Structure 1
Amino acid sequence: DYNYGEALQKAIMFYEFQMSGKLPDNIRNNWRGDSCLGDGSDVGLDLTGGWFDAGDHVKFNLPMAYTATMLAWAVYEYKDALQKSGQLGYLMDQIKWASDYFIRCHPEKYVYYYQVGNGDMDHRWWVPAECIDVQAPRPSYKVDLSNPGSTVTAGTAAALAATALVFKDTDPAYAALCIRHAKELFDFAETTMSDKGYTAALNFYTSHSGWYDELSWAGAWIYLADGDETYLEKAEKYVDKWPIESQTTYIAYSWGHCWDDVHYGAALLLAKITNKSLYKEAIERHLDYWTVGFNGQRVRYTPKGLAHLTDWGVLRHATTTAFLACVYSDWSECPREKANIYIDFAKKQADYALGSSGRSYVVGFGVNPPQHPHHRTAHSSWCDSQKVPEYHRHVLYGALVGGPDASDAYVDDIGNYVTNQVACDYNAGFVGLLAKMYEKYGGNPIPNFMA
């Protein structure tokens, strides 16, 4: 099969290319430099760090927090396989990079900065990250009690709780700090029950499915990290306000786990914590609908076997559902017949990202990978133009692209920010999927690999 170790190595390295702020000397590549060192200056804070969201230089905290949580989840489930691959250290460094930034965004219990950079203005400039902050201001945006944002604060709480979970055995003091922040952010979200102040991300990362699944998401992670039963109880309380499948009274099953809908993953977590049939039925309904089908309906598939939920970041969706399939099928309480269907599904989605259709969809990996991702800093224009140079100056190793259409059709095109898009949330579940594939099938990573 494909070299899952190499793919895992590169999928993790992808995040180094997304880093904002003062880079550590530990970094492997030689083309990224310090950037956006004034972030937060407009409000007197150090809000540097974190990840650029996609091929732009806005820091969008909702997908950033989702990403950090998923990366931590990969460590939690597959620590041993990640240590064997030699990549656990790099992944842990990235998790802490994001969470260090979330902490800086939380200077008071009820004040949280959820964005740095203006979307419309950042996107007018096709310039690399080391030059972006010379061309336009970069305002900071926040929510408070008078102007709240329950979705993003609860999402960040989940990220910091999961970070403490995986750092507990390494940096107890850091885990205790993350936990303290996570519980405060959760209270902030639950007390306000509103997204009125979550405005700067409008038309970029608007919350459409509600903050109640983010509360269950965060509550489960806080319980797994601290054991505080208060947050497990609250998690179960808000299940009744998760999205429901239209024309039914079921919990929604026909979409997938993503930055805007985290109730799928929360249902998996709450299943393993409590072993209640409510959560087991809901997740198995989901994963059944995505494999064999459920009640005569089934997620659509391309003829070449890709589970194709929607045209926007299709590989993101298929590899993230595949990751959830890995976790659930590894669980002893998963029916045996189901586990083999779910893990077969997961491997075929991984193989499709890596080359099964005839080409790889991971930049810098496999056969004929994408070469022109919609990414300003890997391209590196010298004149504010997507077309100049006609080849990217730098290889964005590990980046999973948007992907093909429902008939397996795709073409490289730097200008298509749907098919050729790359982003933090695209690679997040992907990392966890590749960890499992490495565990079960191996493939060695490249020795002494540097970009």
Structure 2
Amino acid sequence: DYNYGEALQKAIMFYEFQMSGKLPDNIRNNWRGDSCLGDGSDVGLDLTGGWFDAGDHVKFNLPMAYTATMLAWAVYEYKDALQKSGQLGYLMDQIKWASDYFIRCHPEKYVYYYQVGNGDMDHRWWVPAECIDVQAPRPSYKVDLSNPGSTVTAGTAAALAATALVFKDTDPAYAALCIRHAKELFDFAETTMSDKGYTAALNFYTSHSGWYDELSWAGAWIYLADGDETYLEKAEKYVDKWPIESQTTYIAYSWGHCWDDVHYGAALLLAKITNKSLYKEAIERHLDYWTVGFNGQRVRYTPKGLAHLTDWGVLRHATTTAFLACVYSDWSECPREKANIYIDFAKKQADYALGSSGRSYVVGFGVNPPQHPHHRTAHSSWCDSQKVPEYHRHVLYGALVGGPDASDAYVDDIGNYVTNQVACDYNAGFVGLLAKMYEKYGGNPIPNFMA
């Protein structure tokens, strides 16, 4: 069996490498430094902090909020296992880092900054984070009542709500602040019902599923953290505008939970909150189709056992769906026979990410892991070139790469930003999955681990 403690410890550490702004003194690596300290200067605000999205240095607040919410979800479900591993403190520190940044992006009730950095310009430069802000300006982008962005504002509300949920027992003052910001951002999103202003992320993180599942997503997290039934009532109200499986009348089920489509996770949380069969059927339709099949149709699988939804961030999809299987299979209302099927599914997907096919797909872990992730700072080029140096100067511990194709084929290639891609959302659900696997199978993390 694989060391799920070591994997978990590193999958969490991966986020330290993504940090932007003035780093705290408690960081565990010696190669990341302060960066992009002027973020927000163009609008008179302190918009520093947060995570760089992927191997670039743009801060995209839609996938960032998604990542924070999933990280908080891991704590919510597997707090005790995360403490026993000794990594709960690090994971909590990262959640607050992202949420602190979301709060700074919300200086007024109906003004939310959703992006720092221009996508096209930032991607022209292959330079480390500590040098990026000298090469090109980093403008701030915002939405308001006249140019609204309901998807991203609702997504950030979910993140702050989930943050308040896990910080309420340790820092109630901080939890109260996050809740206040979440309900404001929720009201902002619900009032505008539009993405007319969400324009800086076009061609990078444009959603087509709609902001309504983001509303149910946020409404459930607000209720779990605050108990205000008003936001549970609003969550169930917008279920009828979730995506529907084509050629049917079911709630969509043949995709997966991801930064673009959160109605999957929303259905799981609403099932646990309300115990209604509407949500239980929807999530069980999804997890059934992803395992044994539903109505004679089944998600594609590679011969080596990987659930292969699509070629873009395939492992992000498998590990994330696997995490949902963990949470639901551990639920008391889950049919027992379906529980064993779902959890065996989760272990196989986890083991595939860790090296069941013959090689780890987690940088710096296991056998023959990827060594050339499409990541500017870990590569650390001295001349604006992906090819120079020919080896990464730094190890991007814990990063889950895009993954192999449908025939289990994969090759290291710093230039392939699909197969060798890494990103915040790729590791989000992965943490939750490993937390469960550690709880069940153990495997001790590296003591005193430093990068």
- TM-score normalised to structure 1 length: 1.00
Deviation at 1:300, TM superposition (A): 0.2
Deviation at 1:207, TM superposition (A): 1.3
| Separation in 1, partners of 2:210, 2:282 | 18
| Separation in 1, partners of 2:69, 2:143 | 21
| Separation in 1, partners of 2:297, 2:51 | 38
1:404 partnered with 2:404: yes
| Separation in 2, partners of 1:289, 1:415 | 34
Deviation at 1:382, TM superposition (A): 0.1
| Separation in 1, partners of 2:124, 2:44 | 26
| Separation in 1, partners of 2:310, 2:113 | 31
| Separation in 1, partners of 2:210, 2:277 | 24
CA deviations over 1:224-265 (Å, ceiling 9, x no partner): 000000000000000000000000000000000000000000
| Separation in 2, partners of 1:31, 1:250 | 50
| Separation in 1, partners of 2:449, 2:271 | 39
SS in 1 for 2:113: strand
| Separation in 2, partners of 1:43, 1:80 | 42
SS in 2 for 1:194: coil
| Separation in 2, partners of 1:220, 1:228 | 10
SS in 2 for 1:123: helix
What residue in structure 2 maps to residue 168 of structure 1?
168
Deviation at 1:54, TM superposition (A): 0.1
| Separation in 2, partners of 1:334, 1:348 | 20
| Separation in 2, partners of 1:55, 1:372 | 11
Deviation at 1:81, TM superposition (A): 0.1
| Separation in 2, partners of 1:132, 1:336 | 52
Deviation at 1:196, TM superposition (A): 0.2
CA deviations over 1:88-115 (Å, ceiling 9, x no partner): 0000000000000000000000000000
| Separation in 2, partners of 1:274, 1:230 | 14
What residue in structure 1 maps to residue 70 of structure 2?
70
CA deviations over 1:183-230 (Å, ceiling 9, x no partner): 000000000000000000000000110000000000000000000000
What residue in structure 1 maps to residue 188 of structure 2?
188
CA deviations over 1:370-419 (Å, ceiling 9, x no partner): 00000000000000000000000000000000000000000000000000
SS in 1 for 2:112: strand
Query: Runs of at least 4 residues of structure 1 off by over 4 A?
Result: none
CA deviations over 1:123-157 (Å, ceiling 9, x no partner): 00000000000000000000000000000000000
Deviation at 1:296, TM superposition (A): 0.1
| Separation in 2, partners of 1:394, 1:415 | 17
| Separation in 1, partners of 2:210, 2:336 | 34
| Separation in 1, partners of 2:77, 2:275 | 17
Deviation at 1:24, TM superposition (A): 0.1
| Separation in 2, partners of 1:238, 1:355 | 41
| Separation in 1, partners of 2:184, 2:308 | 38
Task: Give the number of equivalent residue pairs.
Answer: 451
| Separation in 2, partners of 1:359, 1:304 | 12
| Separation in 2, partners of 1:28, 1:398 | 13
Alignment of 1:92-111 (within 5 A): 92-111=92-111
SS in 1 for 2:124: coil
CA deviations over 1:161-187 (Å, ceiling 9, x no partner): 000000000000000000000000000
Deviation at 1:335, TM superposition (A): 0.1
| Separation in 1, partners of 2:141, 2:423 | 21
CA deviations over 1:334-361 (Å, ceiling 9, x no partner): 0000000000000000000000000000
* Unaligned stretches of 5+ residues in structure 2: none
| Separation in 1, partners of 2:172, 2:74 | 20
State the identity %: 100
- TM-score normalised to structure 2 length: 1.00
1:388 partnered with 2:388: yes
Deviation at 1:364, TM superposition (A): 0.0
CA deviations over 1:60-100 (Å, ceiling 9, x no partner): 00000000000000000000000000000000000000000
| Separation in 2, partners of 1:449, 1:135 | 34
| Separation in 1, partners of 2:390, 2:276 | 55
SS in 2 for 1:402: coil
| Separation in 2, partners of 1:303, 1:219 | 40
Measured on the aligned residues, the alpha-carbon RMSD in Å equals 0.1
| Separation in 2, partners of 1:339, 1:203 | 39
| Separation in 2, partners of 1:207, 1:103 | 23
| Separation in 2, partners of 1:221, 1:385 | 43
| Separation in 1, partners of 2:444, 2:114 | 39
Deviation at 1:46, TM superposition (A): 0.1
What residue in structure 2 maps to residue 4 of structure 1?
4
| Separation in 1, partners of 2:406, 2:268 | 28
CA deviations over 1:269-312 (Å, ceiling 9, x no partner): 00000000000000000000000000000000000000000000
| Separation in 1, partners of 2:78, 2:139 | 38
SS in 2 for 1:174: helix
| Separation in 1, partners of 2:195, 2:308 | 30
| Separation in 1, partners of 2:41, 2:187 | 27
| Separation in 1, partners of 2:209, 2:24 | 37
| Separation in 1, partners of 2:22, 2:5 | 29
